[PDB]
Symmetry: C2
Subunit: 133 residues, 2 copies
């Protein structure tokens, strides 16, 4: 049939690299693009089409227990090995990431319907806010 | 409170570039990472945590009408300008993308609960399959 209405999620994606190389996309973009999945939302009325695509990558899971130092490989970022230790400071979850980089850690806490995440490395602080979906 | 259970979607992300530069992530990865959103699914029981993060980028929408040639900028890929023309071949939607690259187009059709997408550029064919979610 001719109706392509719906939300579609990618199952399979073959030779995406050759296609991208043929368009002269640089090596560093290609390396990231090939490990993504796509969702496609198609709204169609007669012969008018609206298409919204989003690309997604699932980083690896982290499982830990507060108080037990664990080994973590940050392969969603710099792919280094750090010894991480997570503890409560009040209701703030605090993690020190012992490794090559000095002063590497993060803090995580709930205030209202928002989750706050402060990432630190050296002198640089990154601040992320999440809302409950 | 101490319970961080839930699905969380990022609202705000400040100084992600400085944090990443401090970890020596290369310029090309940083350029892509900073335009992503994150979803965080937190399962917590007492002091045991399981965290699943996924990064998402929403490509731009394409709207067209079958039979009306339209101007398209492929900024989710090589960011070139092409004159696109979409027509039915039976129940297969066929697009020719007139531009610098020769033999650039795609075909899209439904067979069962699967949507098929064949992307072509020069000699290279990429084949994607989507299932209805």
């Amino acid at each position: 049939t001719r109706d392509q209405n719906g939300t579609w999620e990618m199952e399979s994606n073959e030779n995406f690299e050759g296609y991208m190389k043929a368009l002269d996309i640089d090596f560093c973009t290609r390396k990231i693009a090939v490990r993504c999945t796509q969702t496609k939302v198609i709204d169609q009325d007669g012969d008018n089409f609206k298409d919204k695509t989003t690309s997604t990558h699932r980083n690896y899971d982290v499982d830990f227990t507060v108080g037990v130092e664990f080994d973590e490989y940050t392969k969603s970022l710099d792919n280094r090995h750090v010894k991480a230790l997570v503890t409560w400071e009040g209701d703030v979850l605090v993690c020190v990431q012992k490794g090559e980089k000095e002063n590497r850690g993060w803090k995580k806490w709930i205030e209202g319907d928002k989750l706050y995440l402060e990432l630190t490395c050296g002198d640089q602080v990154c601040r992320q806010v999440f809302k409950k979906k």
